[PDB]
Amino acid sequence: TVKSTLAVDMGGRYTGIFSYTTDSGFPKAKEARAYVLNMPDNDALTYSMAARTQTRHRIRSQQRFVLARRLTYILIEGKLKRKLSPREKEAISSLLRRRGYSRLESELDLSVLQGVESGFFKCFLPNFDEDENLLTQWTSLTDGYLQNNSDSRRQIQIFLESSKDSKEFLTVVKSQHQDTKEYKNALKVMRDDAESMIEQSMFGHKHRRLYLEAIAQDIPRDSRLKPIIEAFSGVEKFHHFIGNLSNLQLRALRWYFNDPSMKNNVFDKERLKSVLVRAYQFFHYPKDLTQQRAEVLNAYEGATDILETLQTLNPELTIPPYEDQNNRRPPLDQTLWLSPRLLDQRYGDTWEIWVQNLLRSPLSKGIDENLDTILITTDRKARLLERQSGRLIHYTSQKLYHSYVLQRLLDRTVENDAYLLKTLVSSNRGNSNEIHQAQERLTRDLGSQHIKKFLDFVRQYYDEVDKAKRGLWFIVEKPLMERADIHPPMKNDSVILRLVGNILCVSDLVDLSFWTRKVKGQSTVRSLCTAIEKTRKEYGNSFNYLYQRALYLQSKGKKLSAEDKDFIKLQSNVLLVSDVIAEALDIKEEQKKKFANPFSLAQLYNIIETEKSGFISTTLAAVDENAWRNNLQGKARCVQLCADTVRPFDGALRNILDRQAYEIAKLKAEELLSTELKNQTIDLVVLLESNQFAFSASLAEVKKSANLSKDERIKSASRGLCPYTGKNLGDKGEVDHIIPRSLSMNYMGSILNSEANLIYCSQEGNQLKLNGRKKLSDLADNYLKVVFGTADRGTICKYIEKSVSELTDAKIVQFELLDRSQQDAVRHALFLEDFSEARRRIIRLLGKINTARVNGTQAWFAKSFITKLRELTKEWCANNQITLAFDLYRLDAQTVSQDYRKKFALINKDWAKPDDKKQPIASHAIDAFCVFAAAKDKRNIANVLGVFDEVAEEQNLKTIAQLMPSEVNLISPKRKSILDKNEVGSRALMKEGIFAEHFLPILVRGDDCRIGFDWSESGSVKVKDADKLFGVLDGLLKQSETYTVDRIKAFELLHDVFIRPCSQKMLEQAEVLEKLHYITQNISVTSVYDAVNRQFKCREEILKDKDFDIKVDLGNRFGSAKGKITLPAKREWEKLVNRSELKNLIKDKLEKTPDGETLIYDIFRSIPVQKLSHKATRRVWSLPKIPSISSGVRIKRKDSNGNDIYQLYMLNDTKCKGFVVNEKGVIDWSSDLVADLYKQPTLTILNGRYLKADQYVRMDQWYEVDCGRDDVIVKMCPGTSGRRYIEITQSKKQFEDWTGYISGSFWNYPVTIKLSSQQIANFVKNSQMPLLGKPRSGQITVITLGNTLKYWYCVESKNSMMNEAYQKAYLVHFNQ
RNA sequence: AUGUCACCUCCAAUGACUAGGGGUUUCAGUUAUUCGUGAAAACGAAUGAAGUCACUCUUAAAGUGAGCUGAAAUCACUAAAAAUUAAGAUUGAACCCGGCUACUGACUCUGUCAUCCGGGU
DNA sequence: CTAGGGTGGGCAACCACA
DNA sequence: TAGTCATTGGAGGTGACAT
DNA sequence: TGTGGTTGCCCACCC
Ligand SMILES: [Mg+2]
Ligand SMILES: [Mg+2]
Ligand SMILES: [Mg+2]
Ligand SMILES: [Mg+2]
Ligand SMILES: [Mg+2]
Ligand SMILES: [Mg+2]
Ligand SMILES: [Mg+2]
């Protein structure tokens, strides 16, 4: 045997790894290797599918609209029997855009408006009548508001401005009524439901198919739709048709267009009818909407012409219900059943004889008792496959009966086991008389000819059970039990009866009549159990502690408070309900004591009354079998069934742990195969650290802390006021992430959905709050007075810092047992400054993706790692006859931390774990080493792992610490490059955000000619001898004095010079076209406001000359025209900063005005009233600037009419695959060799030209360059188009002498070393080597630590000496 | 005490469906007429919407830029539609076809449909 | 467990050089 | 941003047995 | 009056 060992300190980002191989016992000095895996949380690897899912659903919404237009056009040209004009197509598509959401907001309450007299509100609207109720006139007011009545709208803002000061109203109410609180509530509701009408007209369309009403009003007022209207014979029929098609989901349109013959957009009536009935049979309607469902299907199924049904069926009925993807990907239950198939594949028909012989014994009386009921339901996958085949061969009822009896025999409890099979096959024996008579009984019952093989089976079974309980069923080689791999049910009534029977300790529960029994008075079992669960959920995880403390205090005779007296009343209730239940269905006393507690009664209520919300863990066969085995109405008959404990982590957790397990399996793979050994068993033990993190309240913390759903909790935390605007909020608001969704996704790859990050605000406070930061000064003053008692921002800042400073990390993470003040302090700490200690603590404590990546993920990670290492070393073990005998052990984190990490910290000071700051990278390897140091302590681990010589604490504690090697390797995974992927579509292969693509006009006046926008000096550049420009621009220009290029012809020629080799004339034309070309892009006017530091920026920043100047430089070859143009749009920016209400906030040079983006949005507003009710609102206002550019591509797509359009994007990935190498081996460092996922008849690399390359050097080709010295080792690869990658192997003392890095020993180094500009200058100065360059932004990534460092960096800028030395190394390799 | 197993409730993290509303870009349109309400400055309405400024230069006219409005496009191969913004050593997810012999789900429950199963892309 | 602004391109600005 | 549906892990419980 | 090499810095879809 060969002892191979892996120890893993699991980490959300950084994973420590200590691994070795040995012949026996401890490893040598050379065999132990320390690794640290840093998973990139800076988006070098994408684990979260959030960006991919939102891109998928954005494209799905786009294709939903595209296919809805396609279907609408097909049906309308079918109705007209003629082709639509582009104006008709534009009007129909104008109806189809912006269809609004489909949720349930059903009815505004307005109940407080019933008890308020109308005559009090004649002041705001004099036209009101006292004979008319306020509710009726309010309904008519809203009806007028929807009908685009401008007077009604003006009445709305008149009411909005008048009701903000309510001193007169409250004075009159107090003068005529005693209580003013109900009138305060009435005015609050009035101002709360009118402010939501101000919204959803300024921030979004946002209609719950009031789009139907808007389109019903806007169809007759659109003149392009007139020839359609008599074609449909009415505005009503056409509106119903449009609304019915607009309610279709993408899957319906998919099902209609899913045919190659539908590339012709042909109309098929029966296909459309079948698609519509298929579409509305797909939904799971609620119980109150079934009649509506019954209407819609009866329209669609009964259609003798589906096109008239679309015009006839009311589109309000065809609004889809909520999605019900409840059977989406159901779980497979992981119960492990004894397999008749495997048993008669291995033992033939002999195990049948074993079961028959053991059944004949009187000791096995009643072991098959309820099996005629158990065997009805299918329990496993192979039985299901045989039942689908209709040919029961291995899974007949007799074979299942015998296998069930066999497993009940083997899993029998100690009190009932008449054979002591666990003792009989154990390697250790006790007092031999009892084992002697147990073997005698087994021999007498089973038969002496069957004793050997059966016991071998028994030992195998028990071994394979034990592995199954440790999460290691997958490492068995010849299994006897099989996983079920079957979907369980979803808590139907038959499941409810079994679960309630498991609670109540009954076996044959048939109905729930006990639930309706009367306990005391008119209060049923239902009422007391609902009260019990209400109390238990009010007290949370601390309920058991406070309840048991109340019972202990009442037992000892000590005085009870009100809360403990309430708990004593609850104990009286649980005793009464337990007595009534146990008398209702005849439960005896000792079984009544097993559910006479609040928890069992509460979960009785939860099972019986609350609706089902997921699948049960096992199938009903396993539920019934476990109910038989446990025998809760009496004494337990058998041990409960075992299951494969490794539940699947399908998600981003799968991705992170998948990549970690593959990297560790690679390290273990070419650590094993680097050694040379044949035909011997290598046992490979995996060591893991138990990370169990509490996200809800712990017992050890509620003990020291005791001496509304989450959505409603966040809603009630804002106290009915919008935090960002101060408006009365109500219920039509939005839950805002204070730390923005995109920001946290960018630097963390996660969305912080913790309650502290979520604040309930309005649409105004959420749509003006973009990805930019928002501080405490942007919150409204009244909201701060309500929450913190005062609106003083400094006092609130000090209060928040002091209150959060007293909270521990756990008490912040266990968020729900703070009081209201501490919860508000933790949430509002995110509104503080960047340098705030409280905010820096809270942002880090809500990054709970890193805590969930290690929380109990050790079993699945170990399974993944062992399976991968088995498949990498499969051919190596096959070619060397190696058998790998894997193992898994798991170690308590607190034990290894206190008893080994702290001890090594005292022994070696450099090995200490920092608690107040970030851990050094090598410390993770130390933790992994500590895991190994703990695992040698355990006798069970060491007895298979090695020998036992642990004679003293100090001796082994000092002998172990020298095993860890000096150097530690730092493994940085990175995703596959876009040059190597054969599926390049699985990468975001260009950035979203399109750039405006202009060309400079040419102005001619007589002989004189110039390039620019106008004849001003700053707007043009004079061309010397312009006849050469027109000579090299024949066929590309068009005359509008002014000559402008032909956009389509220029784009076609610029694609032709990129995709195919072209003549010199076309290349010169492309050069001129690229020199007249420039790029602008609209950037928002809110960029005058700094959204991060919350201040206005100086005029020299808005009117910075780099943002507007265009450099034009042709040359004599095209007619010399050198100079700089200013962009005319700069004058519009001059309008922005010199306008009436911004010229004082923006200074000439570089106070901190709060919420300036709201001011900018108040400046730009649609003051005129829109004619059309279905019109898009606008929120973002922008002006062009010259943006900074990346590698750009022009894409030739097609518009809806079939015309070629060109849009300019930027690449997200690499554009260059390498550098062209000639026949002699010389690298062409200047030319751009574009990769082959580009170079397509649609794409055009911007300023790109065709290039032929028979051979080239790849960007990944590392070579060792001759650096002129032997102390360092310099490797170099081209890496990128403009920056080489340089890898330096160099002693750490020399690196510190070069740089001045003062991070102490190498154990305290990070994985990414950030050099200051003084340290970069020191590196360049002391290296005295221009061949090294300097690191880009001082970023150095360490590959191996130690006394000799090995680190790589991207050079800040290329340099001819690097290219020369790489050319030298490449020529040395190329000649050989 | 901690290991399985089954339930209950919370918290956190996932990924799945359905989307919504702004952006950006391309292509157009617009740089106003008519009516009645005013002596008029101006107001309102109708023209499907928009229809307002600024540099150049005969002064007009024009050029150019911006705004506004409406459509369209918003990864490529690439399309009827599926996959397509993850990973690649392995995969996962999605979507479609057939089936109801049968695991799961929804109903109007001998059955039909499906997010289920089998297969395919 | 975690202490959070990367990279693969582009541009303009100077400084030799013809 | 909004609905809806499932899963995994942990914390607090109840019940079974088994170290 | 190009032409190439360094240096310095900027960009990225949101709610
Ligand atoms: Mg650890
Ligand atoms: Mg927000
Ligand atoms: Mg660690
Ligand atoms: Mg536009
Ligand atoms: Mg069924
Ligand atoms: Mg189907
Ligand atoms: Mg699916």
Report the distance from CA of residue A1041 to the C1' of nucleotide B61 in Å, as an integer.
14
A965 closest CA partner among A23, A25, A17, A8: A17
Angle at A721 between CA A715 and CA A724, to 5 degrees: 100
**A776-802 burial: b if 16+ Cβ within 10 Å, else e:** bebbbeebbebbbeebebeebbebbbe
Query: How many whole angstroms separate alpha carbon A257 and alpha carbon A265?
Result: 8
CA A493 to ligand 5 centroid distance, Å: 16
Asked whether A1044 and A1002 are in contact (CB, 8 A), the reply is yes
CA of A928 to the centre of ligand 1 (A): 8
Closest to A252 measured CA to CA, from A274, A279, A271, A281: A279
Instruction: State the Cα–Cα distance between residues A1074 and A1077, nearest whole angstrom.
Output: 5
CB A605 within 8 A of CB A531: no
Q: Over A103-126, what HEC string results? A: CCCCCCCCHHHCCCCHHHHCCCCC
Could you tell me the distance, in angstroms and rounded to a whole number, from the CA of residue A1110 to the centre of ligand 4?
A: 23
A1082 DSSP 8-state letter: E
In window 879-938 of A, residues with CB < 7 A from nucleic chain B are 890, 892
Q: How many A from CA of A326 to the centre of ligand 7?
A: 12
Ligand nearest to the CA of A1178: 4
What is the rounded distance in angstroms from the CA atom of residue A829 to the CA atom of residue A842? 7
The single residue listed with the structure tokens 């310099």 is: A1274
**Strand C: which positions are within 7 A of a protein CB?**
1-13
- If you measure from the C-alpha of residue A942 to the centroid of ligand 1, how many angstroms do you get, rounded to a whole number? 21
Q: Which phi and psi angles does A214 have, rounded to 5°?
A: -65, -45
Integer Cα distance of A1368 and A1279 in angstroms: 17
What distance in angstroms lies between residue A931's CA and the mean position of ligand 1's atoms? Answer: 9
Joined together, the tokens standing for residue A690 give 């138990």
Report the alpha-carbon distance of residue A650 to residue A1331 in Å, rounded: 48
Tokens of A764: 């105004």
Separation CA A257–CA A275 (nearest Å) = 10
A78: three-class secondary structure by DSSP: helix
Rg (CA), chain A: 38
A1235's CB contacts (< 8 A; 6+ apart) are A978, A979, A1214, A1215, A1216, A1217
Q: Say how many Å lie between the CA of residue A1177 and the centre of ligand 4.
A: 13
Pick from A973, A982, A975, A979: which is nearest to A1219 by CA? A979
Nearest DNA or RNA nucleotide to A653 (CA to C1'): B14
Nearest CA to A679 among A883, A869, A518? A883
**What is the distance between the alpha carbons of residues A1050 and A1066, in angstroms, rounded to a whole number?**
11
Output the DSSP codes for A479-538. -SEEE--B------HHHHHHHHHHHHT-S-----GGGG-EEETTEEHHHHHHHHHHHHHH
β-partners of residue A1274 are A1288
Nearest CA-CA partner of A379 in A226, A223, A483, A508: A483
Residue A924 parent element (H or E): helix A921-935
**SS3 per-residue string spanning A1032-1079:** CCCCCEEECCEEEECHHHHHHHHHHHHHCCCCHHHHHHHHHHHHHEEE
Non-local (6+) Cβ contacts of A866 within 8 A are A474, A475, A686, A886, A888
CA–CA gap between residue A1289 and residue A1093 (Å, rounded): 42
Structure token pair of residue A657: 């742990």
The Cβ of residue A871 has, within 10 Å, a number of other Cβ atoms equal to 11
Q: What is the DSSP letter of A642?
A: P
Whole-number distance in Å between A1193 CA and B22 C1': 25
Question: In this structure, are residues A41 and A844 in contact, taking their beta carbons and an 8 Å threshold?
Answer: no
Pairing verdict, β A1002-1005 and A1008-1012: antiparallel
Q: Which residues contact A140 (CB under 8 A, 6 or more apart)?
A: none
Q: Which of A329, A330, A333 is nearest to A622 (CA)?
A: A333
The strand pair at A1339-1344 and A1348-1354 is best described as: antiparallel
Task: For residue A335, give the nearest of A612, A642, A546 by alpha carbon.
Answer: A642
Q: Which ligand is nearest to the CA of A1184?
A: 4
Give per-residue burial for A357-393: e unless 16+ CB within 10 Å, then b.
Answer: ebbebeebeebbeebeebbeebbbebbbebeeeeeee
Pairwise CA distance, residues A208 & A104, whole Å:
8
Contacts 24+ apart (CB under 8 A), A139-148: A142/A197, A145/A197, A146/A210, A146/A213, A146/A1173, A147/A217, A148/A217, A148/A1169, A148/A1170, A148/A1171, A148/A1173
Nucleic chain B contacts, protein chain A, residues 1184-1203, CB cut-off 7 A: 1184, 1195, 1197-1200
- Which ligand gives the minimal distance to the CA of A924? 3
Helices A598-608 and A562-584: crossing angle, nearest 10°?
A: 60
Token pair of A1018 as six digits: 């700053």
How many other C-beta atoms are found inside a 10 Å radius of the C-beta of residue A697?
Answer: 21
Task: Using alpha carbons, select from A1126, A1133, A1120 the residue that is nearest to residue A1020.
Answer: A1126
CA distance A1081 to A622: 64
Task: Please give the backbone phi and psi of residue A1192, each rounded to the nearest 5 degrees, phi first.
Answer: -100, 150
Interatomic distance A121 CA / B38 C1' (Å) = 34
Residues 695-724 of A with CB under 7 A from strand B: 695-696, 709-710, 713
C-beta neighbour count of A82 within 10 angstroms:
10
Which two three-digit tokens encode residue A602? 């509460």
In this structure, chain A runs to a length of: 1376
Give distance CA A851 / C1' B13 (Å).
Answer: 9
User: Are the CB atoms for A116 and A122 separated by under 8 Å?
Assistant: no
Judge whether residue A1020 contacts strand B, using its CB and a 7 Å cut-off.
no
Q: Distance from the CA of A186 to the center of ligand 2, in angstroms?
A: 30
The full set of domain ranges for chain A reads: 2-40+651-692+855-954+966-971, 65-103+212-312, 111-198, 336-483, 493-613, 730-847, 991-1210, 1261-1375
CA distance to A407, A571, A589, per residue, from A575 (Å): 39, 6, 12
Report the separation in Å between the CA atom of A1238 and the middle of ligand 6, taken as the mean of its atom positions. Answer: 38
Q: Give the CA A263 to C1' B79 distance in Å.
A: 9
Reported resolution, Å: 2.9
- Using CA atoms, how far residue A72 sits from A245, A302, A311, A821, in Å, is 7, 22, 12, 56
Nucleotide nearest to A651 (CA to C1'): B14
Cα distance between residue A1296 and residue A840, in whole Å: 31
Angle at the Cα of A1026 from the Cα atoms of A1020 and A1031, rounded to 5 degrees: 130
CA of A1082 to the centre of ligand 4 (A): 10
Contact A1276, A1366 (CB under 8 A): yes
3-state secondary structure of A333: strand
Rounded-to-integer distance, Cα A629 and Cα A102, Å:
50
Whole-number Å distance between alpha carbons of A508 and A495: 13
Tokens 């650096």 correspond to A1267
Inter-residue contact A570 to A535 (CB < 8 Å): yes
Backbone angles phi and psi of A947, in degrees to 5:
-115, 175
| Torsion angle defined by CA atoms of residues A1318, A1320, A1326 and A1332, in that order, rounded to the nearest 10 degrees | -170
Q: Are A293 and A317 in contact (CB under 8 A)?
A: no
| A1105, closest nucleotide (Cα–C1') | C12
Helix, coil or strand: residue A415: coil
Closest ligand, as measured to the CA of A13? 3
- Alpha-carbon gap, residue A74 to A307, rounded angstroms: 11
- The full DSSP string for A218-279 is HSTT-GGGHHHHHHTTSHHHHHHHHHHHHT--HHHHHHHH-SGGGGG----HHHHHHHHHHH
Torsion angles phi and psi, residue A1121, rounded to 5: -145, 95
Rounded to the nearest angstrom, the gap between the alpha carbon of residue A1340 and the centroid of all alpha carbons in its chain is 30
Compute the distance from residue A935 Cα to the ligand 4 centre, in Å: 67
Question: What topology does CATH give the domain A2-40+651-692+855-954+966-971?
Answer: Nucleotidyltransferase; domain 5 (3.30.420)
Residue A1312: both structure tokens together: 């990414």
Angstrom distance (rounded) from CA A866 to CA A982: 28
A811-815 contact pairs (CB < 8 A, 24+): A811/A701, A811/A705, A812/A756, A812/A841, A812/A842, A812/A845, A813/A694, A813/A695, A813/A845, A813/A848, A814/A694, A814/A695, A814/A696, A814/A697, A814/A698, A814/A701, A815/A754, A815/A755, A815/A756
Ligand nearest to the CA of A744: 2
| Residue A1020, both tokens | 């043009």
Q: Residue A1234: in which H helix or E strand, if any? A: strand A1233-1234
* The dihedral sign for the CA sequence A1269, A1270, A1273, A1278: positive
DSSP label of A992: E
What are φ and ψ of residue A161, in 5° steps?
A: -75, -30
Q: How far is the CA of A1014 from the C1' of B63 (A)?
A: 8
Note the CA–C1' distance, A847 to D14, in angstroms.
33
Quick check: A267 and A74 in contact, CB under 8 A? Answer: yes
Q: Integer distance in angstroms from CA A1248 to C1' B31?
A: 39
- Please check whether residue A232 is in contact with residue A72, taking contact to mean a CB–CB distance below 8 angstroms: no
DSSP assignment of A813-845 equals HSGGGS-HHHHHHHHHGGGS-TT-HHHHHHHHH
User: Strand A1095-1096 relative to strand A1089-1090: parallel, antiparallel, unpaired?
Assistant: antiparallel
Instruction: Calculate how far, in angstroms, residue A329's C-alpha sits from the geometric centre of ligand 7.
Output: 7
Q: Which helix (H) or strand (E) holds A1255?
A: strand A1255-1258
Q: Which two tokens stand for residue A242?
A: 């449009």
In the beta sheet, which residues pair with residue A995?
A1208
Protein A1175 CA to nucleic acid B21 C1', in Å? 12
- A959: its two tokens: 């002998």
Query: What burial letters (b/e) apply to A204-227, b meaning 16+ CB within 10 Å?
Result: bbbbebbbbbbbbbbbeebeebee
Amino acid at A379: D
Protein residue at shortest CA distance from C1' of B50: A1170
What's the CA gap between A1127 and A1139, in Å, rounded? 19
3-state secondary structure A999-1025: ECCEEEECCEEEEECCCCCCCEEECCC
Tell which residue, A608, A609, A606, A539, has the closest CA to residue A570: A539
**Smallest CA–C1' separation from A872: which nucleotide?**
B89
At a CB cut-off of 8 Å and minimum separation 6, what does A104 contact? A208, A322
Cβ A859 vs Cβ A10: under 8 Å: no
- The label of the residue with tokens 């009818």 reads A273
Whether the CB-CB separation of A130 and A119 falls below 8 Å is answered with yes
- Cα distances (angstroms) measured from residue A858 to each of A8, A654, A656, A890, A1357: 10, 12, 12, 8, 44
Helix (H, G, I), strand (E, B) or coil at A688: strand
Query: How many CA within 13 A on the CB side of residue A1110?
Result: 29
Whole-angstrom distance between the N-terminal and C-terminal Cα of chain A? 44
Q: What is the dihedral of CA A335, A337, A341, A343, to 10 degrees?
A: 140
Longest Cα–Cα distance of chain A, Å, equals 124
In angstroms, the CA A114 to CA A117 distance is: 8
Report in angstroms the alpha-carbon separations of A233 from A228, A238, A240, A594, A1186. 8, 8, 12, 73, 53
DSSP H/E element including A142: helix A134-146
Residues A1134, A1103 contacting (CB under 8 angstroms): yes
Q: Alpha-carbon distance A409 to A357, whole Å?
A: 12
φ/ψ (deg, to 5) at A243 = -65, -35
- Ligand nearest the Cα atom of residue A996: 4
Containing A19, the helix (H) or strand (E) segment is strand A14-22
- What token pair was written down for A1072? 């001129």
Closest amino acid to nucleotide D13 (CA–C1') = A599
- Residue A762: count other Cβ atoms within 10 Å of its Cβ: 28
